[PDB]
Protein backbone atom coordinates (compact mmCIF):
# COMPACT_ATOMS: atom_id res chain seq x y z
CA UNK A 1 0.00 0.00 0.00
CA UNK A 2 2.88 2.37 0.79
CA UNK A 3 4.47 1.61 -2.59
CA UNK A 4 1.14 2.29 -4.33
CA UNK A 5 0.81 5.64 -2.54
CA UNK A 6 4.40 6.57 -3.43
CA UNK A 7 3.84 5.63 -7.08
CA UNK A 8 0.65 7.72 -7.12
CA UNK A 9 2.55 10.73 -5.76
CA UNK A 10 5.31 10.20 -8.34
CA UNK A 11 2.70 9.92 -11.10
CA UNK A 12 1.20 13.25 -10.01
CA UNK A 13 4.71 14.75 -9.99
CA UNK A 14 5.32 13.55 -13.56
CA UNK A 15 1.89 14.88 -14.58
CA UNK A 16 2.67 18.32 -13.13
CA UNK A 17 6.09 18.17 -14.75
CA UNK A 18 8.48 17.40 -11.90
CA UNK A 19 11.04 14.66 -11.39
CA UNK A 20 10.15 11.76 -9.11
CA UNK A 21 13.23 12.62 -7.03
CA UNK A 22 11.62 15.99 -6.30
CA UNK A 23 8.71 14.28 -4.51
CA UNK A 24 10.38 11.10 -3.18
CA UNK A 25 13.18 10.84 -0.63
CA UNK A 26 16.11 8.42 -0.54
CA UNK A 27 14.98 5.29 1.33
CA UNK A 28 16.70 3.51 4.20
CA UNK A 29 15.64 -0.13 4.59
CA UNK A 30 16.97 -3.41 5.92
CA UNK A 31 18.75 -5.21 3.08
CA UNK A 32 17.80 -8.85 2.54
CA UNK A 33 18.04 -11.66 0.03
CA UNK A 34 21.04 -13.99 0.25
CA UNK A 35 22.68 -13.08 -3.08
CA UNK A 36 22.12 -9.35 -2.48
CA UNK A 37 23.60 -9.51 1.03
CA UNK A 38 26.61 -11.55 -0.17
CA UNK A 39 27.22 -8.95 -2.88
CA UNK A 40 27.01 -6.14 -0.32
CA UNK A 41 29.49 -7.94 1.95
CA UNK A 42 31.87 -8.47 -0.98
CA UNK A 43 31.58 -4.77 -1.86
CA UNK A 44 32.09 -3.96 1.87
CA UNK A 45 28.91 -1.87 1.98
CA UNK A 46 27.21 -3.81 4.79
CA UNK A 47 27.63 -2.42 8.31
CA UNK A 48 25.97 -5.29 10.20
CA UNK A 49 25.01 -8.83 9.15
CA UNK A 50 22.47 -11.02 10.96
CA UNK A 51 22.43 -14.68 9.92
CA UNK A 52 19.66 -17.14 10.79
CA UNK A 53 20.75 -20.13 12.86
CA UNK A 54 18.40 -22.65 11.19
CA UNK A 55 19.07 -22.49 7.44
CA UNK A 56 18.45 -25.78 5.62
CA UNK A 57 20.58 -26.52 3.54
CA UNK A 58 23.30 -25.20 5.84
CA UNK A 59 25.73 -24.69 2.93
CA UNK A 60 23.88 -21.48 2.00
CA UNK A 61 25.32 -19.75 5.09
CA UNK A 62 28.24 -21.97 6.16
CA UNK A 63 30.79 -19.73 4.39
CA UNK A 64 29.20 -16.46 5.49
CA UNK A 65 30.89 -15.98 8.92
CA UNK A 66 34.27 -16.57 7.24
CA UNK A 67 33.33 -14.12 4.48
CA UNK A 68 32.40 -11.51 7.09
CA UNK A 69 35.67 -12.12 8.95
CA UNK A 70 37.67 -11.69 5.73
CA UNK A 71 35.85 -8.48 4.79
CA UNK A 72 35.92 -7.12 8.35
CA UNK A 73 32.13 -7.02 8.66
CA UNK A 74 30.41 -7.34 12.06
CA UNK A 75 28.15 -10.38 11.95
CA UNK A 76 25.92 -12.16 14.42
CA UNK A 77 24.06 -15.46 14.34
CA UNK A 78 20.45 -14.98 15.46
CA UNK A 79 17.59 -17.35 16.28
CA UNK A 80 14.80 -17.35 13.71
CA UNK A 81 14.67 -17.23 9.96
CA UNK A 82 10.95 -16.65 10.54
CA UNK A 83 11.98 -13.86 12.92
CA UNK A 84 13.98 -12.22 10.13
CA UNK A 85 11.05 -12.81 7.78
CA UNK A 86 8.89 -10.74 10.12
CA UNK A 87 11.37 -7.91 9.53
CA UNK A 88 11.34 -8.28 5.76
CA UNK A 89 7.57 -9.04 5.36
CA UNK A 90 8.29 -12.66 4.42
CA UNK A 91 7.79 -16.08 5.93
CA UNK A 92 11.55 -16.67 6.07
CA UNK A 93 14.77 -14.72 5.58
CA UNK A 94 18.11 -16.51 5.67
CA UNK A 95 20.15 -13.34 6.27
CA UNK A 96 19.59 -9.60 6.72
CA UNK A 97 22.01 -6.71 6.50
CA UNK A 98 22.19 -3.09 7.59
CA UNK A 99 24.26 -0.89 5.28
CA UNK A 100 23.31 2.63 6.40
CA UNK A 101 20.67 4.20 8.64
CA UNK A 102 19.34 7.70 9.19
CA UNK A 103 21.25 10.35 11.13
CA UNK A 104 18.97 10.02 14.16
CA UNK A 105 19.78 6.28 14.32
CA UNK B 1 53.81 -15.06 -38.61
CA UNK B 2 56.70 -16.64 -40.51
CA UNK B 3 56.36 -16.31 -44.28
CA UNK B 4 55.93 -19.58 -46.15
CA UNK B 5 58.55 -20.71 -48.65
CA UNK B 6 56.11 -21.31 -51.50
CA UNK B 7 57.21 -24.95 -51.88
CA UNK B 8 55.30 -28.21 -51.54
CA UNK B 9 57.70 -29.74 -48.98
CA UNK B 10 60.26 -28.74 -46.38
CA UNK B 11 60.20 -26.43 -43.40
CA UNK B 12 57.66 -23.57 -43.47
CA UNK B 13 56.14 -25.09 -46.61
CA UNK B 14 52.92 -23.93 -48.21
CA UNK B 15 51.39 -21.34 -50.52
CA UNK B 16 52.42 -17.76 -49.78
CA UNK B 17 49.71 -15.56 -48.25
CA UNK B 18 49.81 -12.33 -46.26
CA UNK B 19 48.97 -13.66 -42.81
CA UNK B 20 46.80 -11.52 -40.54
CA UNK B 21 47.01 -10.94 -36.80
CA UNK B 22 43.73 -11.72 -35.06
CA UNK B 23 42.10 -10.14 -32.06
CA UNK B 24 41.81 -13.02 -29.62
CA UNK B 25 38.43 -14.73 -29.56
CA UNK B 26 36.58 -14.52 -26.21
CA UNK B 27 35.95 -18.29 -26.31
CA UNK B 28 39.72 -18.76 -25.85
CA UNK B 29 39.72 -16.89 -22.52
CA UNK B 30 38.66 -20.07 -20.69
CA UNK B 31 41.27 -21.02 -18.11
CA UNK B 32 42.12 -17.40 -17.32
CA UNK B 33 41.81 -16.77 -13.60
CA UNK B 34 39.45 -14.08 -12.31
CA UNK B 35 39.74 -12.01 -9.13
CA UNK B 36 36.34 -13.07 -7.79
CA UNK B 37 37.05 -16.73 -8.58
CA UNK B 38 40.40 -16.41 -6.77
CA UNK B 39 38.69 -14.95 -3.71
CA UNK B 40 35.87 -17.52 -3.65
CA UNK B 41 38.19 -20.50 -4.14
CA UNK B 42 40.59 -19.25 -1.46
CA UNK B 43 37.71 -18.77 0.98
CA UNK B 44 36.28 -22.23 0.22
CA UNK B 45 39.73 -23.80 0.65
CA UNK B 46 40.10 -22.04 4.02
CA UNK B 47 36.62 -23.11 5.16
CA UNK B 48 36.69 -26.73 3.98
CA UNK B 49 40.33 -27.75 4.42
CA UNK B 50 41.95 -30.75 2.77
CA UNK B 51 41.09 -34.24 1.55
CA UNK B 52 42.71 -37.29 3.20
CA UNK B 53 44.80 -38.05 0.10
CA UNK B 54 45.87 -34.39 0.01
CA UNK B 55 46.93 -34.72 3.65
CA UNK B 56 48.91 -37.86 2.79
CA UNK B 57 50.70 -36.10 -0.09
CA UNK B 58 51.40 -33.10 2.17
CA UNK B 59 52.88 -35.44 4.79
CA UNK B 60 55.10 -37.05 2.14
CA UNK B 61 56.22 -33.63 0.87
CA UNK B 62 57.05 -32.50 4.42
CA UNK B 63 59.03 -35.72 4.92
CA UNK B 64 60.82 -34.98 1.63
CA UNK B 65 59.78 -38.14 -0.25
CA UNK B 66 59.03 -36.30 -3.48
CA UNK B 67 59.14 -39.32 -5.81
CA UNK B 68 56.85 -41.31 -3.52
CA UNK B 69 54.52 -38.31 -3.27
CA UNK B 70 54.34 -38.04 -7.07
CA UNK B 71 53.71 -41.79 -7.41
CA UNK B 72 50.97 -41.73 -4.76
CA UNK B 73 49.33 -38.67 -6.32
CA UNK B 74 49.46 -40.38 -9.73
CA UNK B 75 47.79 -43.47 -8.27
CA UNK B 76 45.11 -41.30 -6.65
CA UNK B 77 44.39 -38.89 -9.52
CA UNK B 78 45.03 -41.05 -12.59
CA UNK B 79 47.36 -39.02 -14.81
CA UNK B 80 50.94 -37.81 -14.51
CA UNK B 81 50.22 -34.17 -15.35
CA UNK B 82 47.35 -33.82 -12.87
CA UNK B 83 49.51 -35.52 -10.23
CA UNK B 84 52.35 -33.09 -10.92
CA UNK B 85 50.12 -29.99 -10.79
CA UNK B 86 48.60 -31.20 -7.51
CA UNK B 87 52.16 -31.63 -6.21
CA UNK B 88 53.11 -28.00 -6.89
CA UNK B 89 49.76 -26.88 -5.46
CA UNK B 90 50.37 -28.73 -2.19
CA UNK B 91 53.99 -27.52 -2.13
CA UNK B 92 52.68 -23.94 -2.40
CA UNK B 93 50.27 -24.67 0.48
CA UNK B 94 53.18 -25.98 2.59
CA UNK B 95 55.27 -22.92 1.69
CA UNK B 96 52.44 -20.58 2.72
CA UNK B 97 52.07 -22.47 6.02
CA UNK B 98 55.81 -22.22 6.71
CA UNK B 99 55.98 -18.52 5.84
CA UNK B 100 52.98 -17.94 8.12
CA UNK B 101 54.68 -19.88 10.93
Amino acid sequence: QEKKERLLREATAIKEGKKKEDVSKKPYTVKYGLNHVVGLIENKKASLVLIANDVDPIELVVFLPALCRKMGIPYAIIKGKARLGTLVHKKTAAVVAITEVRSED
Amino acid sequence: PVERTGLIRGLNKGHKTTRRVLKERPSRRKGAQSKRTQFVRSLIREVAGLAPYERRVIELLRNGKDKRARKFSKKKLGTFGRAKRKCEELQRIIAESRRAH
Binding site: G39, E42, N43, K44, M71 | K35, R36, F39
Partner: peptide, 8 residues
Amino acid sequence: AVSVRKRA
Protein backbone atom coordinates in the same frame (compact mmCIF):
# COMPACT_ATOMS: atom_id res chain seq x y z
CA ALA C 1 36.63 -5.03 -2.14
CA VAL C 2 35.55 -7.77 -4.55
CA SER C 3 33.26 -6.84 -7.44
CA VAL C 4 31.49 -9.06 -9.96
CA ARG C 5 31.53 -6.32 -12.63
CA LYS C 6 31.85 -2.60 -13.22
CA ARG C 7 28.64 -0.84 -12.21
CA ALA C 8 26.98 2.37 -13.35
